[PDB]
PDB file of C-alpha atoms and ligand atoms in Angstrom:
ATOM      1  CA  UNK A  81     105.594  72.706  99.778  1.00 58.00           C
ATOM      2  CA  UNK A  82     106.364  75.211  97.006  1.00 58.00           C
ATOM      3  CA  UNK A  83     106.239  78.023  99.551  1.00 62.24           C
ATOM      4  CA  UNK A  84     108.745  76.334 101.887  1.00 62.01           C
ATOM      5  CA  UNK A  85     111.088  75.599  98.983  1.00 60.27           C
ATOM      6  CA  UNK A  86     110.885  79.231  97.884  1.00 59.26           C
ATOM      7  CA  UNK A  87     112.084  80.369 101.318  1.00 61.22           C
ATOM      8  CA  UNK A  88     114.803  77.709 101.562  1.00 59.31           C
ATOM      9  CA  UNK A  89     116.159  78.728  98.134  1.00 60.04           C
ATOM     10  CA  UNK A  90     116.534  82.341  99.313  1.00 58.70           C
ATOM     11  CA  UNK A  91     117.834  81.404 102.755  1.00 58.57           C
ATOM     12  CA  UNK A  92     120.394  79.040 101.239  1.00 59.59           C
ATOM     13  CA  UNK A  93     121.110  81.034  98.102  1.00 60.10           C
ATOM     14  CA  UNK A  94     120.299  77.933  96.030  1.00 63.24           C
ATOM     15  CA  UNK A  95     119.282  78.677  92.375  1.00 65.59           C
ATOM     16  CA  UNK A  96     118.628  75.020  91.532  1.00 65.01           C
ATOM     17  CA  UNK A  97     116.125  74.813  94.400  1.00 65.98           C
ATOM     18  CA  UNK A  98     114.392  77.953  93.106  1.00 68.66           C
ATOM     19  CA  UNK A  99     114.183  76.405  89.636  1.00 73.60           C
ATOM     20  CA  UNK A 100     111.967  73.664  91.100  1.00 75.05           C
ATOM     21  CA  UNK A 101     109.241  76.124  92.192  1.00 79.52           C
ATOM     22  CA  UNK A 102     109.393  78.628  89.296  1.00 77.89           C
ATOM     23  CA  UNK A 103     107.601  78.493  85.955  1.00 80.12           C
ATOM     24  CA  UNK A 104     108.405  80.384  82.675  1.00 78.20           C
ATOM     25  CA  UNK A 105     105.529  82.812  83.375  1.00 77.89           C
ATOM     26  CA  UNK A 106     106.544  83.533  86.985  1.00 75.34           C
ATOM     27  CA  UNK A 107     106.448  87.318  87.367  1.00 73.83           C
ATOM     28  CA  UNK A 108     108.588  89.096  89.970  1.00 75.31           C
ATOM     29  CA  UNK A 109     109.009  92.710  91.029  1.00 75.78           C
ATOM     30  CA  UNK A 110     112.125  93.441  93.075  1.00 75.02           C
ATOM     31  CA  UNK A 111     111.601  97.059  94.170  1.00 76.45           C
ATOM     32  CA  UNK A 112     110.238  97.973  90.757  1.00 78.48           C
ATOM     33  CA  UNK A 113     112.684  95.851  88.755  1.00 77.79           C
ATOM     34  CA  UNK A 114     110.752  93.230  86.795  1.00 74.29           C
ATOM     35  CA  UNK A 115     112.031  89.670  86.414  1.00 75.49           C
ATOM     36  CA  UNK A 116     110.226  86.873  84.528  1.00 76.42           C
ATOM     37  CA  UNK A 117     110.779  83.091  84.463  1.00 73.29           C
ATOM     38  CA  UNK A 118     114.404  81.976  84.511  1.00 69.64           C
ATOM     39  CA  UNK A 119     115.392  85.557  85.441  1.00 70.52           C
ATOM     40  CA  UNK A 120     114.091  84.659  88.925  1.00 71.73           C
ATOM     41  CA  UNK A 121     116.618  81.794  89.095  1.00 71.32           C
ATOM     42  CA  UNK A 122     119.328  84.282  88.062  1.00 70.19           C
ATOM     43  CA  UNK A 123     118.168  86.572  90.875  1.00 68.40           C
ATOM     44  CA  UNK A 124     119.080  83.804  93.294  1.00 69.56           C
ATOM     45  CA  UNK A 125     122.454  83.165  91.670  1.00 69.80           C
ATOM     46  CA  UNK A 126     123.104  86.832  92.359  1.00 69.95           C
ATOM     47  CA  UNK A 127     122.211  86.333  96.034  1.00 66.32           C
ATOM     48  CA  UNK A 128     124.758  83.532  96.201  1.00 65.61           C
ATOM     49  CA  UNK A 129     127.435  85.473  94.292  1.00 66.10           C
ATOM     50  CA  UNK A 130     127.041  88.447  96.607  1.00 65.87           C
ATOM     51  CA  UNK A 131     127.074  86.377  99.777  1.00 65.58           C
ATOM     52  CA  UNK A 132     123.668  87.741 100.881  1.00 63.69           C
ATOM     53  CA  UNK A 133     122.126  86.121 103.934  1.00 67.97           C
ATOM     54  CA  UNK A 134     118.354  85.991 103.896  1.00 71.28           C
ATOM     55  CA  UNK A 135     116.458  84.950 107.007  1.00 73.18           C
ATOM     56  CA  UNK A 136     112.686  84.413 107.328  1.00 73.07           C
ATOM     57  CA  UNK A 137     111.430  86.207 110.463  1.00 74.97           C
ATOM     58  CA  UNK A 138     107.647  85.688 110.193  1.00 76.21           C
ATOM     59  CA  UNK A 139     104.868  85.026 107.703  1.00 80.65           C
ATOM     60  CA  UNK A 140     101.113  84.925 107.151  1.00 82.51           C
ATOM     61  CA  UNK A 141      98.939  83.170 104.557  1.00 84.70           C
ATOM     62  CA  UNK A 142      95.513  83.648 103.001  1.00 82.89           C
ATOM     63  CA  UNK A 143      94.550  80.993 100.461  1.00 82.17           C
ATOM     64  CA  UNK A 144      97.277  80.917  97.791  1.00 85.78           C
ATOM     65  CA  UNK A 145      98.793  84.216  99.003  1.00 85.90           C
ATOM     66  CA  UNK A 146     101.763  84.283 101.348  1.00 87.52           C
ATOM     67  CA  UNK A 147     103.451  87.236 102.937  1.00 86.18           C
ATOM     68  CA  UNK A 148     106.908  86.951 104.493  1.00 84.05           C
ATOM     69  CA  UNK A 149     108.963  89.389 106.592  1.00 85.59           C
ATOM     70  CA  UNK A 150     112.658  88.664 106.039  1.00 82.23           C
ATOM     71  CA  UNK A 151     115.948  90.249 107.009  1.00 83.22           C
ATOM     72  CA  UNK A 152     118.737  90.477 104.453  1.00 86.80           C
ATOM     73  CA  UNK A 153     122.355  90.785 105.606  1.00 86.58           C
ATOM     74  CA  UNK A 154     125.190  92.011 103.376  1.00 88.25           C
ATOM     75  CA  UNK A 155     128.525  93.451 104.572  1.00 89.10           C
ATOM     76  CA  UNK A 156     127.656  93.840 108.267  1.00 84.67           C
ATOM     77  CA  UNK A 157     124.425  95.576 107.175  1.00 87.88           C
ATOM     78  CA  UNK A 158     120.975  94.101 108.112  1.00 90.71           C
ATOM     79  CA  UNK A 159     117.732  95.350 106.551  1.00 94.01           C
ATOM     80  CA  UNK A 160     114.043  94.280 106.565  1.00 92.26           C
ATOM     81  CA  UNK A 161     112.128  93.293 103.428  1.00 90.93           C
ATOM     82  CA  UNK A 162     108.624  92.149 102.737  1.00 87.46           C
ATOM     83  CA  UNK A 163     108.188  89.287 100.262  1.00 88.15           C
ATOM     84  CA  UNK A 164     104.792  88.445  98.825  1.00 87.47           C
ATOM     85  CA  UNK A 165     104.140  85.296  96.746  1.00 85.09           C
ATOM     86  CA  UNK A 166     101.190  83.761  94.936  1.00 84.52           C
ATOM     87  CA  UNK A 167     101.362  79.953  94.594  1.00 83.28           C
ATOM     88  CA  UNK A 168      99.375  77.867  92.070  1.00 84.52           C
ATOM     89  CA  UNK A 169      99.773  74.215  91.084  1.00 83.86           C
ATOM     90  CA  UNK A 170     102.985  73.805  93.105  1.00 85.58           C
ATOM     91  CA  UNK A 171     104.581  76.861  91.355  1.00 82.65           C
ATOM     92  CA  UNK A 172     105.241  80.415  92.375  1.00 84.55           C
ATOM     93  CA  UNK A 173     103.229  82.535  89.944  1.00 84.46           C
ATOM     94  CA  UNK A 174     103.902  86.083  91.218  1.00 87.72           C
ATOM     95  CA  UNK A 175     106.479  87.497  93.647  1.00 87.85           C
ATOM     96  CA  UNK A 176     107.068  90.951  95.098  1.00 89.61           C
ATOM     97  CA  UNK A 177     110.120  91.960  97.118  1.00 91.63           C
ATOM     98  CA  UNK A 178     109.822  95.376  98.723  1.00 93.42           C
ATOM     99  CA  UNK A 179     112.160  97.258 101.048  1.00 90.11           C
ATOM    100  CA  UNK A 180     110.618  98.424 104.327  1.00 89.64           C
TER     101      UNK A 180
ATOM    102  CA  UNK B 974      90.587 100.069  89.571  1.00 90.18           C
ATOM    103  CA  UNK B 975      89.763  97.522  92.265  1.00 90.72           C
ATOM    104  CA  UNK B 976      93.227  98.027  93.785  1.00 91.70           C
ATOM    105  CA  UNK B 977      92.784 101.820  94.005  1.00 92.40           C
ATOM    106  CA  UNK B 978      89.346 101.445  95.567  1.00 91.10           C
ATOM    107  CA  UNK B 979      90.757  99.008  98.119  1.00 86.87           C
ATOM    108  CA  UNK B 980      93.281 101.609  99.245  1.00 86.79           C
ATOM    109  CA  UNK B 981      90.758 104.460  99.291  1.00 87.93           C
ATOM    110  CA  UNK B 982      88.364 102.417 101.431  1.00 87.30           C
ATOM    111  CA  UNK B 983      91.093 101.944 104.058  1.00 86.72           C
ATOM    112  CA  UNK B 984      92.433 105.474 103.801  1.00 86.04           C
ATOM    113  CA  UNK B 985      88.895 106.901 104.145  1.00 87.54           C
ATOM    114  CA  UNK B 986      87.533 104.243 106.509  1.00 90.33           C
ATOM    115  CA  UNK B 987      84.651 103.668 104.083  1.00 90.64           C
ATOM    116  CA  UNK B 988      83.001 100.231 104.409  1.00 91.06           C
ATOM    117  CA  UNK B 989      80.592 100.813 101.526  1.00 90.40           C
ATOM    118  CA  UNK B 990      83.541 101.460  99.206  1.00 92.43           C
ATOM    119  CA  UNK B 991      85.193  98.202 100.398  1.00 91.23           C
ATOM    120  CA  UNK B 992      81.922  96.313  99.647  1.00 95.20           C
ATOM    121  CA  UNK B 993      82.351  97.245  95.965  1.00 95.79           C
ATOM    122  CA  UNK B 994      85.693  95.397  95.635  1.00 97.63           C
ATOM    123  CA  UNK B 995      85.049  92.394  97.933  1.00 98.06           C
ATOM    124  CA  UNK B 996      83.418  89.083  97.064  1.00100.28           C
ATOM    125  CA  UNK B 997      81.860  86.427  99.413  1.00 99.64           C
ATOM    126  CA  UNK B 998      84.946  84.257  99.046  1.00 98.30           C
ATOM    127  CA  UNK B 999      87.460  87.044  99.714  1.00 97.92           C
ATOM    128  CA  UNK B1000      89.921  85.673 102.263  1.00 99.77           C
ATOM    129  CA  UNK B1001      91.854  87.938 104.586  1.00100.95           C
ATOM    130  CA  UNK B1002      94.479  87.370 107.282  1.00102.22           C
ATOM    131  CA  UNK B1003      95.009  90.297 109.628  1.00101.38           C
ATOM    132  CA  UNK B1004      98.065  89.242 111.650  1.00101.17           C
ATOM    133  CA  UNK B1005      96.802  85.663 111.877  1.00 97.21           C
ATOM    134  CA  UNK B1006      93.129  86.568 112.373  1.00 97.02           C
ATOM    135  CA  UNK B1007      91.081  85.229 109.467  1.00 95.43           C
ATOM    136  CA  UNK B1008      88.192  87.176 107.933  1.00 94.79           C
ATOM    137  CA  UNK B1009      86.087  86.010 104.979  1.00 96.74           C
ATOM    138  CA  UNK B1010      83.622  87.900 102.729  1.00 93.64           C
ATOM    139  CA  UNK B1011      81.469  90.491 104.497  1.00 96.26           C
ATOM    140  CA  UNK B1012      83.737  90.162 107.535  1.00 94.65           C
ATOM    141  CA  UNK B1013      86.224  92.265 105.473  1.00 94.89           C
ATOM    142  CA  UNK B1014      83.605  95.049 105.211  1.00 94.66           C
ATOM    143  CA  UNK B1015      83.126  94.813 108.998  1.00 98.19           C
ATOM    144  CA  UNK B1016      86.931  95.120 109.384  1.00 94.99           C
ATOM    145  CA  UNK B1017      86.634  98.560 107.718  1.00 96.05           C
ATOM    146  CA  UNK B1018      83.691  99.589 109.872  1.00 94.81           C
ATOM    147  CA  UNK B1019      86.018  98.918 112.813  1.00 98.12           C
ATOM    148  CA  UNK B1020      88.662 101.213 111.296  1.00 98.84           C
ATOM    149  CA  UNK B1021      86.108 103.954 111.061  1.00101.13           C
ATOM    150  CA  UNK B1022      84.710 103.315 114.594  1.00100.03           C
ATOM    151  CA  UNK B1023      88.219 103.450 116.071  1.00100.47           C
ATOM    152  CA  UNK B1024      89.224 106.594 114.161  1.00102.11           C
ATOM    153  CA  UNK B1025      92.236 104.820 112.578  1.00 99.23           C
ATOM    154  CA  UNK B1026      94.092 106.768 109.941  1.00 98.07           C
ATOM    155  CA  UNK B1027      95.615 104.610 107.209  1.00 97.72           C
ATOM    156  CA  UNK B1028      98.023 106.171 104.692  1.00 96.98           C
ATOM    157  CA  UNK B1029      99.543 104.451 101.647  1.00 99.68           C
ATOM    158  CA  UNK B1030     103.300 105.154 101.570  1.00101.07           C
ATOM    159  CA  UNK B1031     104.442 103.038  98.618  1.00103.44           C
ATOM    160  CA  UNK B1032     103.499  99.987  96.555  1.00105.33           C
ATOM    161  CA  UNK B1033     104.661  97.489  93.941  1.00104.12           C
ATOM    162  CA  UNK B1034     102.779  95.157  91.588  1.00104.79           C
ATOM    163  CA  UNK B1035     103.443  91.890  89.742  1.00106.22           C
ATOM    164  CA  UNK B1036     100.556  90.716  87.565  1.00105.97           C
ATOM    165  CA  UNK B1037      97.463  90.435  89.825  1.00103.77           C
ATOM    166  CA  UNK B1038      99.557  90.740  93.007  1.00102.71           C
ATOM    167  CA  UNK B1039      99.976  94.078  94.786  1.00102.32           C
ATOM    168  CA  UNK B1040     102.055  94.863  97.841  1.00105.27           C
ATOM    169  CA  UNK B1041     101.495  98.100  99.804  1.00107.74           C
ATOM    170  CA  UNK B1042     103.464  99.686 102.627  1.00108.04           C
ATOM    171  CA  UNK B1043     101.103 101.751 104.778  1.00107.87           C
ATOM    172  CA  UNK B1044     101.253 103.617 108.049  1.00106.21           C
ATOM    173  CA  UNK B1045      98.427 103.321 110.528  1.00110.82           C
ATOM    174  CA  UNK B1046      97.858 106.094 113.090  1.00113.96           C
ATOM    175  CA  UNK B1047      95.795 105.629 116.285  1.00111.59           C
ATOM    176  CA  UNK B1048      96.010 107.758 119.452  1.00106.84           C
ATOM    177  CA  UNK B1049      99.160 109.688 118.553  1.00106.85           C
ATOM    178  CA  UNK B1050     100.800 106.329 117.692  1.00110.01           C
ATOM    179  CA  UNK B1051     102.074 105.630 114.108  1.00111.64           C
ATOM    180  CA  UNK B1052     103.092 102.131 112.928  1.00112.58           C
ATOM    181  CA  UNK B1053     104.063 100.514 109.627  1.00112.05           C
ATOM    182  CA  UNK B1054     102.144  97.625 108.068  1.00112.74           C
ATOM    183  CA  UNK B1055     102.492  95.617 104.878  1.00112.48           C
ATOM    184  CA  UNK B1056      99.330  94.849 102.936  1.00112.10           C
ATOM    185  CA  UNK B1057      99.278  92.251 100.150  1.00113.10           C
ATOM    186  CA  UNK B1058      96.293  91.757  97.835  1.00112.32           C
ATOM    187  CA  UNK B1059      95.423  89.480  94.979  1.00111.57           C
ATOM    188  CA  UNK B1060      92.928  90.932  92.452  1.00115.51           C
ATOM    189  CA  UNK B1061      90.845  88.949  89.967  1.00115.52           C
ATOM    190  CA  UNK B1062      87.874  90.021  87.858  1.00115.33           C
ATOM    191  CA  UNK B1063      87.705  93.435  89.521  1.00118.12           C
ATOM    192  CA  UNK B1064      87.501  91.838  92.999  1.00118.90           C
ATOM    193  CA  UNK B1065      90.009  91.409  95.825  1.00124.05           C
ATOM    194  CA  UNK B1066      90.364  87.632  96.273  1.00124.41           C
ATOM    195  CA  UNK B1067      93.000  87.423  99.032  1.00123.18           C
ATOM    196  CA  UNK B1068      94.417  90.006 101.472  1.00122.11           C
ATOM    197  CA  UNK B1069      97.146  89.868 104.100  1.00120.04           C
ATOM    198  CA  UNK B1070      97.814  92.642 106.609  1.00118.59           C
ATOM    199  CA  UNK B1071     101.025  92.122 108.587  1.00119.71           C
ATOM    200  CA  UNK B1072     102.737  94.290 111.196  1.00118.01           C
ATOM    201  CA  UNK B1073     106.369  95.208 110.459  1.00117.31           C
TER     202      UNK B1073
HETATM  203 ZN1   ZN C2564     114.775  80.447 108.299  1.00117.89          ZN
HETATM  204 ZN1   ZN C2565      97.047 108.038 100.158  1.00118.67          ZN
END
């Protein structure tokens, strides 16, 4: 459930949805930039502010680890990103977003 | 340490190195194919048997989560793959290998 909500929050640029699956100790690396806790919710506000369109293309899963391939669109420009998450107790604990 | 050994085992096609950082409950998904425990060591034997050349290009990290971008070469053919790992207690617990 948490994993689906994570994707929907990005795809819809919905910070309040992302708040539901984040914890204060959620750790995220966005291409080397570190964000913790509510900073992850702010990351999503920035998606919405910019008008970024995220689309899930495909994913795999092993236990509590998920790996997503997504495209991000911004100003007629489409690019591929890999997004890795660890889920525990209905919360996203760690997140990595990396440019391909 | 475990994370570096994981990469070196792939890059060098060394099953015995991979044995050092795997546990019996290590779970791996290789593009939807599930491997557990010693099956991960056998995955590396298959790399070496085939003559596959893996090269780490870049990586990021958030807590115990690592995400690697690697190229794999095989028969004059080079392709990009994303490799996500979770490390705990010096062991790889979960692994995902996904084609880009
Ligand atoms: Zn979608
Ligand atoms: Zn290397």
